[PDB]
Amino acid sequence: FEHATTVPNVPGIPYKALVERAGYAPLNLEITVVSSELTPSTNKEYVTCRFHTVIPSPQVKCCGSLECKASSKADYTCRVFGGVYPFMWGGAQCFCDSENTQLSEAYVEFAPDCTIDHAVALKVHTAALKVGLRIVYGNTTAHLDTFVNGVTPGSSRDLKVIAGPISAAFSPFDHKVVIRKGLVYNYDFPEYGAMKPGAFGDIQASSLDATDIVARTDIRLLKPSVKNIHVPYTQAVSGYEMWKNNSGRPLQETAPFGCKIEVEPLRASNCAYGHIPISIDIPDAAFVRSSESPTILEVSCTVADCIYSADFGGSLTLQYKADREGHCPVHSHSTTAVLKEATTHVTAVGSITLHFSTSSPQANFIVSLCGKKTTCNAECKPPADHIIGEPHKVDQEFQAAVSKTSWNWLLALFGGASSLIVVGLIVLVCSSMLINTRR
Amino acid sequence: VNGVTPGSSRDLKVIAGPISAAFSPFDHKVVIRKGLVYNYDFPEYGAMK
Amino acid sequence: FEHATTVPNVPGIPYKALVERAGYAPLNLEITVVSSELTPSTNKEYVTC
Amino acid sequence: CPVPLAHTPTVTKWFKGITLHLTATRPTLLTTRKLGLRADATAEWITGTTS
Protein backbone atom coordinates (compact mmCIF):
# COMPACT_ATOMS: atom_id res chain seq x y z
CA PHE A 1 0.00 0.00 0.00
CA GLU A 2 1.30 3.41 -1.05
CA HIS A 3 0.02 6.56 0.61
CA ALA A 4 0.31 9.94 -1.06
CA THR A 5 -0.02 13.52 0.13
CA THR A 6 1.18 17.01 -0.59
CA VAL A 7 3.85 18.33 1.77
CA PRO A 8 4.71 22.00 2.39
CA ASN A 9 8.16 22.68 0.98
CA VAL A 10 9.27 24.38 4.18
CA PRO A 11 12.58 23.24 5.69
CA GLY A 12 12.56 22.08 9.29
CA ILE A 13 8.76 21.95 9.43
CA PRO A 14 7.69 18.52 10.70
CA TYR A 15 4.59 18.21 8.55
CA LYS A 16 2.52 15.23 9.63
CA ALA A 17 0.13 12.93 7.81
CA LEU A 18 -2.01 9.99 8.86
CA VAL A 19 -2.13 6.85 6.73
CA GLU A 20 -5.36 4.86 6.69
CA ARG A 21 -4.63 1.39 5.30
CA ALA A 22 -7.93 0.40 6.91
CA GLY A 23 -7.14 -3.29 6.96
CA TYR A 24 -4.80 -2.20 9.77
CA ALA A 25 -4.97 0.49 12.41
CA PRO A 26 -3.86 4.00 11.39
CA LEU A 27 -0.17 4.83 11.56
CA ASN A 28 1.45 8.20 12.19
CA LEU A 29 3.56 9.58 9.35
CA GLU A 30 5.81 12.65 9.34
CA ILE A 31 7.28 14.02 6.12
CA THR A 32 10.01 16.45 7.16
CA VAL A 33 11.98 18.44 4.58
CA VAL A 34 15.41 18.33 6.22
CA SER A 35 17.04 20.30 3.44
CA SER A 36 16.55 21.30 -0.17
CA GLU A 37 19.15 21.62 -2.91
CA LEU A 38 17.58 23.18 -5.97
CA THR A 39 20.45 22.78 -8.43
CA PRO A 40 20.38 24.71 -11.71
CA SER A 41 21.76 23.13 -14.85
CA THR A 42 24.64 25.35 -15.91
CA ASN A 43 27.82 25.58 -17.94
CA LYS A 44 30.88 27.79 -17.68
CA GLU A 45 30.29 30.35 -20.41
CA TYR A 46 33.69 31.89 -19.70
CA VAL A 47 35.98 32.95 -16.90
CA THR A 48 36.82 36.61 -16.44
CA CYS A 49 38.90 38.79 -14.15
CA ARG A 50 41.03 41.91 -14.06
CA PHE A 51 43.09 41.63 -17.23
CA HIS A 52 46.82 42.31 -17.20
CA THR A 53 48.03 44.31 -20.20
CA VAL A 54 51.38 42.84 -21.11
CA ILE A 55 53.38 45.30 -23.20
CA PRO A 56 56.26 43.16 -24.49
CA SER A 57 59.35 45.22 -25.14
CA PRO A 58 58.93 46.85 -28.55
CA GLN A 59 60.58 45.54 -31.68
CA VAL A 60 62.86 48.11 -33.27
CA LYS A 61 64.33 48.32 -36.75
CA CYS A 62 67.11 50.67 -37.76
CA CYS A 63 66.80 50.62 -41.56
CA GLY A 64 63.23 49.74 -42.54
CA SER A 65 59.62 49.15 -41.62
CA LEU A 66 58.21 46.25 -39.62
CA GLU A 67 55.11 44.28 -40.55
CA CYS A 68 52.28 44.19 -38.01
CA LYS A 69 52.20 40.38 -38.08
CA ALA A 70 48.91 39.46 -36.43
CA SER A 71 48.85 37.17 -33.40
CA SER A 72 46.32 34.97 -31.65
CA LYS A 73 47.02 36.76 -28.36
CA ALA A 74 43.97 38.33 -26.76
CA ASP A 75 43.02 41.78 -28.07
CA TYR A 76 46.26 41.83 -30.06
CA THR A 77 46.26 45.34 -31.55
CA CYS A 78 49.87 46.20 -32.36
CA ARG A 79 50.82 49.28 -34.37
CA VAL A 80 53.95 50.29 -36.29
CA PHE A 81 55.40 53.79 -35.94
CA GLY A 82 58.04 55.71 -37.86
CA GLY A 83 60.36 58.44 -36.65
CA VAL A 84 60.78 56.62 -33.34
CA TYR A 85 64.57 57.14 -32.92
CA PRO A 86 64.33 55.99 -29.30
CA PHE A 87 67.01 56.24 -26.65
CA MET A 88 67.83 53.90 -23.79
CA TRP A 89 69.83 54.32 -20.59
CA GLY A 90 72.99 54.34 -22.66
CA GLY A 91 71.83 56.27 -25.70
CA ALA A 92 70.26 56.04 -29.12
CA GLN A 93 69.51 52.48 -30.23
CA CYS A 94 69.32 52.98 -34.00
CA PHE A 95 71.58 53.87 -36.91
CA CYS A 96 69.64 56.49 -38.84
CA ASP A 97 67.02 59.15 -38.14
CA SER A 98 63.69 58.87 -40.01
CA GLU A 99 64.61 55.54 -41.61
CA ASN A 100 64.12 53.75 -38.29
CA THR A 101 60.71 52.40 -37.33
CA GLN A 102 59.26 50.79 -34.23
CA LEU A 103 56.54 48.25 -33.57
CA SER A 104 54.73 48.55 -30.26
CA GLU A 105 53.08 45.30 -29.25
CA ALA A 106 50.52 44.81 -26.50
CA TYR A 107 47.91 42.24 -25.50
CA VAL A 108 46.19 41.02 -22.35
CA GLU A 109 46.40 37.97 -20.11
CA PHE A 110 44.82 37.05 -16.80
CA ALA A 111 46.58 38.74 -13.92
CA PRO A 112 48.32 36.19 -11.67
CA ASP A 113 45.83 36.77 -8.85
CA CYS A 114 42.93 35.94 -11.19
CA THR A 115 43.43 32.26 -10.26
CA ILE A 116 41.45 33.10 -7.12
CA ASP A 117 39.17 36.05 -7.93
CA HIS A 118 37.81 35.06 -11.33
CA ALA A 119 34.13 35.58 -12.16
CA VAL A 120 32.85 32.30 -13.61
CA ALA A 121 30.01 33.33 -15.92
CA LEU A 122 27.27 30.69 -16.06
CA LYS A 123 24.08 30.37 -18.05
CA VAL A 124 21.23 28.98 -15.93
CA HIS A 125 18.65 26.41 -17.02
CA THR A 126 15.56 25.15 -15.17
CA ALA A 127 16.80 23.86 -11.84
CA ALA A 128 15.75 20.40 -10.66
CA LEU A 129 14.84 20.42 -6.97
CA LYS A 130 16.44 17.84 -4.67
CA VAL A 131 15.43 17.45 -1.02
CA GLY A 132 16.81 15.52 1.92
CA LEU A 133 13.79 14.07 3.71
CA ARG A 134 13.63 12.54 7.17
CA ILE A 135 10.62 10.26 7.33
CA VAL A 136 9.25 8.61 10.45
CA TYR A 137 6.33 6.19 10.54
CA GLY A 138 5.47 4.59 13.87
CA ASN A 139 8.53 3.47 15.76
CA THR A 140 10.30 3.05 12.41
CA THR A 141 12.13 6.00 10.88
CA ALA A 142 14.47 6.65 7.97
CA HIS A 143 16.26 9.52 6.24
CA LEU A 144 16.66 9.93 2.49
CA ASP A 145 17.52 12.29 -0.38
CA THR A 146 15.14 12.39 -3.36
CA PHE A 147 15.44 14.51 -6.47
CA VAL A 148 12.03 16.18 -6.68
CA ASN A 149 11.14 15.51 -10.31
CA GLY A 150 8.17 13.18 -9.84
CA VAL A 151 9.70 10.16 -11.58
CA THR A 152 12.81 9.04 -9.73
CA PRO A 153 12.33 6.77 -6.71
CA GLY A 154 15.04 8.14 -4.43
CA SER A 155 14.26 5.17 -2.22
CA SER A 156 16.07 4.40 1.03
CA ARG A 157 15.62 1.34 3.23
CA ASP A 158 12.17 0.13 2.19
CA LEU A 159 10.52 3.53 1.60
CA LYS A 160 9.67 3.84 -2.11
CA VAL A 161 9.53 7.64 -1.77
CA ILE A 162 8.86 9.64 -4.94
CA ALA A 163 8.63 13.42 -5.04
CA GLY A 164 7.42 16.18 -7.33
CA PRO A 165 7.07 17.92 -9.64
CA ILE A 166 6.84 21.16 -7.64
CA SER A 167 3.37 22.65 -7.34
CA ALA A 168 4.91 25.90 -8.63
CA ALA A 169 8.27 25.95 -10.40
CA PHE A 170 10.63 28.68 -9.23
CA SER A 171 14.35 29.30 -9.78
CA PRO A 172 16.05 32.18 -7.93
CA PHE A 173 18.71 32.51 -10.63
CA ASP A 174 18.09 34.69 -13.64
CA HIS A 175 18.80 33.32 -17.11
CA LYS A 176 22.36 34.65 -16.71
CA VAL A 177 24.42 34.47 -13.52
CA VAL A 178 28.00 35.10 -12.40
CA ILE A 179 29.96 33.72 -9.43
CA ARG A 180 32.76 35.69 -7.76
CA LYS A 181 34.81 34.50 -4.76
CA GLY A 182 31.78 32.39 -3.83
CA LEU A 183 29.46 35.36 -4.07
CA VAL A 184 26.88 35.09 -6.83
CA TYR A 185 25.05 37.74 -8.83
CA ASN A 186 22.24 37.55 -11.33
CA TYR A 187 23.63 39.55 -14.23
CA ASP A 188 23.19 39.77 -18.00
CA PHE A 189 26.84 39.17 -18.79
CA PRO A 190 27.78 39.44 -22.47
CA GLU A 191 27.86 36.16 -24.34
CA TYR A 192 31.06 34.45 -25.43
CA GLY A 193 32.86 36.64 -27.93
CA ALA A 194 30.67 39.64 -27.05
CA MET A 195 33.44 41.47 -25.19
CA LYS A 196 32.96 45.22 -24.89
CA PRO A 197 35.45 47.68 -23.38
CA GLY A 198 34.93 49.08 -19.92
CA ALA A 199 32.31 46.49 -19.00
CA PHE A 200 32.03 43.04 -17.50
CA GLY A 201 33.45 40.33 -19.71
CA ASP A 202 35.98 42.52 -21.49
CA ILE A 203 38.37 39.56 -21.27
CA GLN A 204 37.09 36.00 -21.48
CA ALA A 205 38.29 32.44 -21.91
CA SER A 206 36.98 28.89 -21.72
CA SER A 207 39.09 28.46 -18.59
CA LEU A 208 41.62 30.54 -16.72
CA ASP A 209 44.55 28.36 -17.72
CA ALA A 210 43.34 28.10 -21.33
CA THR A 211 45.11 29.81 -24.22
CA ASP A 212 41.71 30.46 -25.85
CA ILE A 213 41.62 34.05 -24.57
CA VAL A 214 39.63 36.72 -26.41
CA ALA A 215 39.33 40.33 -25.40
CA ARG A 216 37.94 43.73 -26.31
CA THR A 217 39.47 46.56 -24.32
CA ASP A 218 39.81 49.61 -26.61
CA ILE A 219 43.56 49.15 -26.19
CA ARG A 220 45.26 51.68 -28.43
CA LEU A 221 48.84 52.85 -28.58
CA LEU A 222 50.13 56.35 -29.10
CA LYS A 223 53.09 57.28 -31.21
CA PRO A 224 56.26 57.19 -29.05
CA SER A 225 57.10 60.72 -28.03
CA VAL A 226 59.52 60.99 -25.12
CA LYS A 227 63.25 60.76 -25.85
CA ASN A 228 63.53 57.58 -23.80
CA ILE A 229 62.11 54.47 -25.41
CA HIS A 230 58.55 54.12 -24.23
CA VAL A 231 55.22 52.72 -25.29
CA PRO A 232 52.56 55.12 -23.98
CA TYR A 233 49.15 53.50 -24.29
CA THR A 234 45.66 53.75 -22.85
CA GLN A 235 42.75 51.42 -22.22
CA ALA A 236 39.37 51.36 -20.58
CA VAL A 237 39.45 50.59 -16.88
CA SER A 238 39.38 46.84 -16.35
CA GLY A 239 35.75 45.98 -16.92
CA TYR A 240 35.86 43.27 -14.28
CA GLU A 241 37.03 45.79 -11.70
CA MET A 242 34.51 48.37 -12.91
CA TRP A 243 31.73 45.85 -12.35
CA LYS A 244 33.33 44.97 -9.02
CA ASN A 245 32.85 48.55 -7.83
CA ASN A 246 29.24 48.60 -9.08
CA SER A 247 28.28 44.96 -8.49
CA GLY A 248 25.10 45.80 -6.63
CA ARG A 249 24.01 43.28 -4.07
CA PRO A 250 24.76 39.57 -4.47
CA LEU A 251 21.94 37.07 -4.84
CA GLN A 252 22.78 35.63 -1.42
CA GLU A 253 21.30 38.85 -0.04
CA THR A 254 18.55 39.08 -2.66
CA ALA A 255 17.09 35.70 -3.61
CA PRO A 256 13.44 35.37 -2.57
CA PHE A 257 11.79 32.55 -0.62
CA GLY A 258 14.69 32.63 1.82
CA CYS A 259 16.86 30.55 -0.50
CA LYS A 260 20.34 30.18 0.86
CA ILE A 261 22.82 30.18 -2.02
CA GLU A 262 25.76 27.79 -2.10
CA VAL A 263 28.52 27.60 -4.68
CA GLU A 264 30.60 24.74 -6.04
CA PRO A 265 28.14 23.62 -7.37
CA LEU A 266 25.82 26.61 -7.70
CA ARG A 267 22.62 25.72 -5.89
CA ALA A 268 19.80 27.06 -3.74
CA SER A 269 19.59 25.44 -0.31
CA ASN A 270 16.86 25.18 2.33
CA CYS A 271 14.60 27.27 0.13
CA ALA A 272 10.93 27.35 1.11
CA TYR A 273 8.50 27.59 -1.81
CA GLY A 274 5.29 25.77 -2.82
CA HIS A 275 4.31 22.19 -2.05
CA ILE A 276 6.00 18.86 -2.77
CA PRO A 277 3.72 16.01 -3.89
CA ILE A 278 4.82 12.90 -2.02
CA SER A 279 3.89 9.23 -2.35
CA ILE A 280 5.32 6.54 -0.10
CA ASP A 281 4.79 2.77 -0.44
CA ILE A 282 5.57 2.23 3.23
CA PRO A 283 6.43 -1.39 4.08
CA ASP A 284 3.16 -2.88 5.21
CA ALA A 285 5.00 -4.83 7.90
CA ALA A 286 5.01 -1.45 9.66
CA PHE A 287 1.25 -1.60 10.16
CA VAL A 288 -0.39 -3.37 13.06
CA ARG A 289 -3.73 -5.13 12.82
CA SER A 290 -6.68 -3.00 13.87
CA SER A 291 -7.70 -5.79 16.24
CA GLU A 292 -4.24 -6.02 17.80
CA SER A 293 -3.79 -2.26 17.94
CA PRO A 294 -5.61 -0.36 20.67
CA THR A 295 -8.92 1.17 19.70
CA ILE A 296 -11.09 3.63 21.59
CA LEU A 297 -14.78 3.05 22.21
CA GLU A 298 -15.34 6.78 22.71
CA VAL A 299 -13.40 10.04 22.77
CA SER A 300 -14.36 13.69 23.17
CA CYS A 301 -12.40 16.87 22.54
CA THR A 302 -12.20 19.56 25.20
CA VAL A 303 -9.83 22.34 24.16
CA ALA A 304 -8.31 24.64 26.76
CA ASP A 305 -7.42 28.29 26.18
CA CYS A 306 -5.67 28.35 22.81
CA ILE A 307 -3.62 30.94 20.97
CA TYR A 308 -3.35 30.94 17.19
CA SER A 309 0.32 31.42 16.37
CA ALA A 310 3.30 29.91 14.61
CA ASP A 311 4.32 27.92 17.69
CA PHE A 312 2.16 25.33 19.46
CA GLY A 313 0.18 28.02 21.23
CA GLY A 314 -2.91 25.82 21.52
CA SER A 315 -3.59 23.11 24.08
CA LEU A 316 -6.40 20.56 24.28
CA THR A 317 -7.44 17.60 26.43
CA LEU A 318 -9.06 14.40 25.16
CA GLN A 319 -11.05 12.00 27.32
CA TYR A 320 -11.07 8.45 26.00
CA LYS A 321 -12.58 5.02 26.49
CA ALA A 322 -10.26 2.35 25.12
CA ASP A 323 -10.44 -1.40 24.68
CA ARG A 324 -6.79 -1.93 25.59
CA GLU A 325 -3.82 0.19 26.60
CA GLY A 326 -1.16 0.98 24.03
CA HIS A 327 0.08 3.68 21.67
CA CYS A 328 -2.67 5.15 19.52
CA PRO A 329 -1.74 7.42 16.63
CA VAL A 330 -3.06 10.96 16.81
CA HIS A 331 -3.28 13.44 13.99
CA SER A 332 -5.22 16.41 12.66
CA HIS A 333 -7.50 15.75 9.71
CA SER A 334 -7.91 19.50 9.12
CA THR A 335 -5.31 21.46 7.17
CA THR A 336 -5.85 24.50 9.40
CA ALA A 337 -4.45 22.83 12.52
CA VAL A 338 -1.49 20.60 13.36
CA LEU A 339 -0.65 18.81 16.60
CA LYS A 340 2.77 18.76 18.23
CA GLU A 341 2.55 15.16 19.39
CA ALA A 342 1.87 12.36 16.94
CA THR A 343 1.43 9.32 19.21
CA THR A 344 0.39 8.90 22.81
CA HIS A 345 0.58 6.06 25.28
CA VAL A 346 -3.06 5.52 26.19
CA THR A 347 -4.57 3.61 29.10
CA ALA A 348 -7.89 1.78 29.32
CA VAL A 349 -9.64 4.98 30.46
CA GLY A 350 -8.22 8.42 31.15
CA SER A 351 -7.43 11.85 29.76
CA ILE A 352 -4.86 12.57 27.09
CA THR A 353 -3.62 16.09 26.47
CA LEU A 354 -1.99 17.46 23.33
CA HIS A 355 -0.18 20.66 22.46
CA PHE A 356 -1.19 22.07 19.11
CA SER A 357 -0.67 24.98 16.73
CA THR A 358 -3.18 26.61 14.40
CA SER A 359 -3.64 29.73 12.33
CA SER A 360 -7.43 29.87 12.42
CA PRO A 361 -9.15 31.84 15.20
CA GLN A 362 -11.66 29.00 15.45
CA ALA A 363 -10.85 25.48 16.61
CA ASN A 364 -13.12 23.47 14.30
CA PHE A 365 -10.46 20.92 13.43
CA ILE A 366 -11.22 17.19 13.48
CA VAL A 367 -8.64 15.60 15.77
CA SER A 368 -8.34 11.84 15.44
CA LEU A 369 -7.08 9.21 17.86
CA CYS A 370 -6.76 5.56 16.75
CA GLY A 371 -8.88 6.66 13.79
CA LYS A 372 -11.84 7.84 15.85
CA LYS A 373 -12.81 11.39 15.00
CA THR A 374 -14.09 14.23 17.18
CA THR A 375 -14.84 17.82 16.21
CA CYS A 376 -12.99 20.21 18.48
CA ASN A 377 -14.73 23.56 18.85
CA ALA A 378 -13.60 26.78 20.56
CA GLU A 379 -12.40 30.35 20.10
CA CYS A 380 -8.64 30.87 19.96
CA LYS A 381 -7.39 34.30 21.01
CA PRO A 382 -4.90 36.44 19.07
CA PRO A 383 -1.21 36.09 19.97
CA ALA A 384 0.25 38.46 22.53
CA ASP A 385 3.74 38.38 20.94
CA HIS A 386 4.08 39.92 17.48
CA ILE A 387 7.23 38.01 16.50
CA ILE A 388 8.72 34.56 17.06
CA GLY A 389 11.88 32.87 15.82
CA GLU A 390 10.07 30.08 14.03
CA PRO A 391 8.08 29.90 10.78
CA HIS A 392 4.34 29.46 10.91
CA LYS A 393 3.76 25.74 11.14
CA VAL A 394 0.59 25.94 9.04
CA ASP A 395 -0.96 27.88 6.18
CA GLN A 396 -4.25 29.79 6.42
CA GLU A 397 -7.33 30.05 4.22
CA PHE A 398 -10.01 32.73 4.09
CA GLN A 399 -12.71 30.14 4.80
CA ALA A 400 -10.95 29.62 8.14
CA ALA A 401 -9.44 33.08 8.67
CA VAL A 402 -12.86 34.57 9.34
CA SER A 403 -13.71 33.99 12.97
CA LYS A 404 -16.77 31.98 13.97
CA THR A 405 -18.57 34.98 15.45
CA SER A 406 -17.32 37.41 12.80
CA TRP A 407 -18.46 34.94 10.15
CA ASN A 408 -21.86 34.68 11.84
CA TRP A 409 -22.16 38.48 11.82
CA LEU A 410 -21.16 38.90 8.18
CA LEU A 411 -23.47 36.12 7.04
CA ALA A 412 -26.28 37.57 9.17
CA LEU A 413 -25.84 40.90 7.39
CA PHE A 414 -25.97 39.33 3.94
CA GLY A 415 -28.84 37.11 5.08
CA GLY A 416 -30.72 40.20 6.17
CA ALA A 417 -30.20 41.96 2.85
CA SER A 418 -31.14 38.84 0.87
CA SER A 419 -34.21 38.17 3.03
CA LEU A 420 -35.29 41.81 2.64
CA ILE A 421 -35.13 41.64 -1.15
CA VAL A 422 -36.91 38.28 -0.87
CA VAL A 423 -39.68 39.99 1.12
CA GLY A 424 -39.84 42.58 -1.65
CA LEU A 425 -40.30 39.90 -4.30
CA ILE A 426 -42.87 38.07 -2.16
CA VAL A 427 -44.95 41.16 -1.50
CA LEU A 428 -44.82 42.21 -5.16
CA VAL A 429 -46.10 38.81 -6.33
CA CYS A 430 -48.69 38.57 -3.54
CA SER A 431 -50.04 42.08 -4.09
CA SER A 432 -50.22 41.55 -7.85
CA MET A 433 -52.21 38.34 -7.39
CA LEU A 434 -54.42 39.88 -4.68
CA ILE A 435 -55.40 42.68 -7.05
CA ASN A 436 -55.74 40.68 -10.28
CA THR A 437 -57.79 37.85 -8.72
CA ARG A 438 -60.63 40.38 -8.35
CA ARG A 439 -59.59 42.67 -11.22
CA VAL B 1 25.46 36.29 -34.51
CA ASN B 2 24.05 38.39 -31.68
CA GLY B 3 23.98 41.80 -33.36
CA VAL B 4 26.89 43.30 -31.41
CA THR B 5 30.07 41.21 -31.49
CA PRO B 6 32.54 43.00 -33.80
CA GLY B 7 34.21 40.30 -35.84
CA SER B 8 36.91 42.88 -36.59
CA SER B 9 39.45 41.52 -39.07
CA ARG B 10 42.19 43.80 -40.42
CA ASP B 11 40.35 47.03 -41.39
CA LEU B 12 36.89 45.42 -41.60
CA LYS B 13 34.84 45.60 -38.42
CA VAL B 14 31.54 43.76 -38.91
CA ILE B 15 28.45 42.93 -36.86
CA ALA B 16 25.87 40.29 -37.70
CA GLY B 17 22.43 39.17 -36.62
CA PRO B 18 20.09 38.41 -35.04
CA ILE B 19 19.20 35.31 -37.10
CA SER B 20 15.86 35.44 -38.92
CA ALA B 21 14.76 32.34 -36.98
CA ALA B 22 15.18 30.93 -33.48
CA PHE B 23 15.69 27.47 -35.00
CA SER B 24 18.01 24.86 -33.54
CA PRO B 25 18.45 21.26 -34.72
CA PHE B 26 19.23 19.86 -31.30
CA ASP B 27 16.18 19.09 -29.24
CA HIS B 28 16.22 20.09 -25.58
CA LYS B 29 17.68 16.68 -24.66
CA VAL B 30 20.49 15.09 -26.69
CA VAL B 31 22.98 12.27 -26.14
CA ILE B 32 26.35 11.79 -27.86
CA ARG B 33 27.77 8.36 -28.68
CA LYS B 34 31.05 7.72 -30.52
CA GLY B 35 30.57 11.08 -32.22
CA LEU B 36 27.02 10.29 -33.26
CA VAL B 37 24.32 12.29 -31.51
CA TYR B 38 20.64 11.63 -30.99
CA ASN B 39 17.91 13.91 -29.74
CA TYR B 40 16.28 11.83 -27.02
CA ASP B 41 14.28 12.35 -23.83
CA PHE B 42 16.82 10.78 -21.51
CA PRO B 43 15.94 10.65 -17.80
CA GLU B 44 17.53 13.42 -15.77
CA TYR B 45 20.41 12.84 -13.39
CA GLY B 46 19.35 10.86 -10.36
CA ALA B 47 16.51 9.40 -12.42
CA MET B 48 17.26 5.78 -13.28
CA LYS B 49 14.84 3.28 -14.74
CA PHE C 1 30.45 54.00 -43.78
CA GLU C 2 28.45 51.29 -42.01
CA HIS C 3 26.76 49.62 -44.94
CA ALA C 4 23.96 47.26 -43.95
CA THR C 5 22.54 44.33 -45.88
CA THR C 6 20.71 41.07 -45.36
CA VAL C 7 22.43 37.87 -46.42
CA PRO C 8 20.81 34.52 -47.27
CA ASN C 9 21.97 32.27 -44.46
CA VAL C 10 23.31 29.66 -46.89
CA PRO C 11 26.88 28.32 -46.61
CA GLY C 12 28.85 28.45 -49.83
CA ILE C 13 26.29 30.54 -51.72
CA PRO C 14 28.00 33.83 -52.56
CA TYR C 15 25.58 36.67 -51.86
CA LYS C 16 26.61 39.64 -53.98
CA ALA C 17 25.69 43.16 -52.92
CA LEU C 18 26.56 46.66 -54.07
CA VAL C 19 27.25 49.63 -51.81
CA GLU C 20 26.27 53.02 -53.23
CA ARG C 21 27.89 56.06 -51.60
CA ALA C 22 27.39 59.63 -52.82
CA GLY C 23 30.95 60.75 -53.41
CA TYR C 24 32.25 57.41 -54.62
CA ALA C 25 31.73 54.97 -57.43
CA PRO C 26 29.78 51.92 -56.26
CA LEU C 27 31.88 49.18 -54.72
CA ASN C 28 31.37 45.49 -55.34
CA LEU C 29 30.62 43.69 -52.08
CA GLU C 30 30.43 39.91 -52.22
CA ILE C 31 29.67 38.25 -48.89
CA THR C 32 29.74 34.47 -48.55
CA VAL C 33 29.15 32.19 -45.60
CA VAL C 34 32.25 30.04 -46.00
CA SER C 35 31.45 28.23 -42.77
CA SER C 36 28.93 28.33 -39.97
CA GLU C 37 29.06 26.84 -36.51
CA LEU C 38 25.68 26.74 -34.80
CA THR C 39 26.90 25.56 -31.41
CA PRO C 40 24.55 25.43 -28.44
CA SER C 41 25.83 25.61 -24.91
CA THR C 42 25.61 22.23 -23.19
CA ASN C 43 26.57 20.64 -19.90
CA LYS C 44 27.46 17.05 -19.16
CA GLU C 45 24.55 15.53 -17.29
CA TYR C 46 25.99 12.05 -16.90
CA VAL C 47 27.90 9.37 -18.74
CA THR C 48 26.40 5.98 -19.47
CA CYS C 49 27.37 2.70 -21.09
CA CYS D 1 40.72 35.60 8.69
CA PRO D 2 38.92 36.95 11.76
CA VAL D 3 36.14 39.49 11.30
CA PRO D 4 34.44 41.49 14.07
CA LEU D 5 30.90 40.93 15.33
CA ALA D 6 29.17 44.15 16.37
CA HIS D 7 27.00 43.91 19.49
CA THR D 8 23.93 41.91 18.52
CA PRO D 9 21.12 44.27 17.48
CA THR D 10 18.41 44.65 20.09
CA VAL D 11 15.15 43.67 18.39
CA THR D 12 11.79 45.27 19.13
CA LYS D 13 8.59 43.48 18.18
CA TRP D 14 5.42 45.17 16.94
CA PHE D 15 2.48 44.53 14.62
CA LYS D 16 3.81 43.01 11.38
CA GLY D 17 6.98 45.00 11.91
CA ILE D 18 10.27 44.77 13.76
CA THR D 19 12.64 47.50 14.88
CA LEU D 20 16.38 46.90 14.84
CA HIS D 21 18.49 49.01 17.18
CA LEU D 22 22.00 48.86 15.81
CA THR D 23 25.36 49.93 17.20
CA ALA D 24 28.61 49.68 15.27
CA THR D 25 31.45 52.14 15.58
CA ARG D 26 32.62 51.15 12.09
CA PRO D 27 30.63 50.86 8.84
CA THR D 28 28.65 47.63 9.01
CA LEU D 29 26.50 46.01 6.34
CA LEU D 30 22.87 45.25 7.19
CA THR D 31 20.83 43.22 4.73
CA THR D 32 17.20 42.18 5.01
CA ARG D 33 14.95 40.21 2.71
CA LYS D 34 11.45 38.79 2.96
CA LEU D 35 11.14 35.05 2.48
CA GLY D 36 7.98 35.55 0.41
CA LEU D 37 7.09 35.40 -3.26
CA ARG D 38 9.18 38.54 -3.71
CA ALA D 39 12.42 39.27 -1.91
CA ASP D 40 12.03 43.04 -1.51
CA ALA D 41 15.69 42.82 -0.56
CA THR D 42 17.46 45.90 0.76
CA ALA D 43 20.99 46.66 1.92
CA GLU D 44 22.33 49.48 4.06
CA TRP D 45 25.73 50.31 5.51
CA ILE D 46 24.95 51.43 9.04
CA THR D 47 27.36 53.54 11.07
CA GLY D 48 27.41 54.48 14.73
CA THR D 49 24.22 53.88 16.67
CA THR D 50 20.83 54.12 15.00
CA SER D 51 17.47 52.40 14.60
Swiss-Prot record, chain A:
Disulfide bonds join C49-C114, C62-C94, C63-C96, C68-C78, C259-C271, C301-C376, C306-C380, C328-C370. The chain crosses the membrane at residues 409-429. It is a single-pass type I membrane protein. Residues 13-408 are extracellular. It comes from the Viruses. N-glycosylated. Glycans are attached at N139, N245, N270. Residues 84-101 are annotated as: E1 fusion peptide loop. It is found in: Virion membrane; Host cell membrane. Residues 430-439 are cytoplasmic. Class II viral fusion protein. Fusion activity is inactive as long as E1 is bound to E2 in mature virion. After virus attachment to target cell receptor PCDH10 and endocytosis, acidification of the endosome induce dissociation of E1/E2 heterodimer and concomitant trimerization of the E1 subunits. This E1 trimer is fusion active, and promotes release of viral nucleocapsid in cytoplasm after endosome and viral membrane fusion. Efficient fusion requires the presence of cholesterol and sphingolipid in the target membrane. Interacts with spike glycoprotein E2. The precursor of protein E3/E2 and E1 form a heterodimer shortly after synthesis. Processing of the precursor of protein E3/E2 into E2 and E3 results in a heterodimer of the spike glycoproteins E2 and E1. Spike at virion surface are constituted of three E2-E1 heterodimers. After target cell attachment and endocytosis, E1 change conformation to form homotrimers. Interacts with 6K protein. This is Spike glycoprotein E1.
From Swiss-Prot, chain C:
It is found in: Virion membrane; Host cell membrane. It is a single-pass type I membrane protein. Signal peptide: none annotated. N-glycosylated. Class II viral fusion protein. Fusion activity is inactive as long as E1 is bound to E2 in mature virion. After virus attachment to target cell receptor PCDH10 and endocytosis, acidification of the endosome induce dissociation of E1/E2 heterodimer and concomitant trimerization of the E1 subunits. This E1 trimer is fusion active, and promotes release of viral nucleocapsid in cytoplasm after endosome and viral membrane fusion. Efficient fusion requires the presence of cholesterol and sphingolipid in the target membrane. Interacts with spike glycoprotein E2. The precursor of protein E3/E2 and E1 form a heterodimer shortly after synthesis. Processing of the precursor of protein E3/E2 into E2 and E3 results in a heterodimer of the spike glycoproteins E2 and E1. Spike at virion surface are constituted of three E2-E1 heterodimers. After target cell attachment and endocytosis, E1 change conformation to form homotrimers. Interacts with 6K protein. This is Spike glycoprotein E1. It comes from Western equine encephalitis virus. The lineage of its organism: Viruses, Riboviria, Orthornavirae, Kitrinoviricota, Alsuviricetes. The chain holds residues 798 to 846 of 1236 of the full protein.
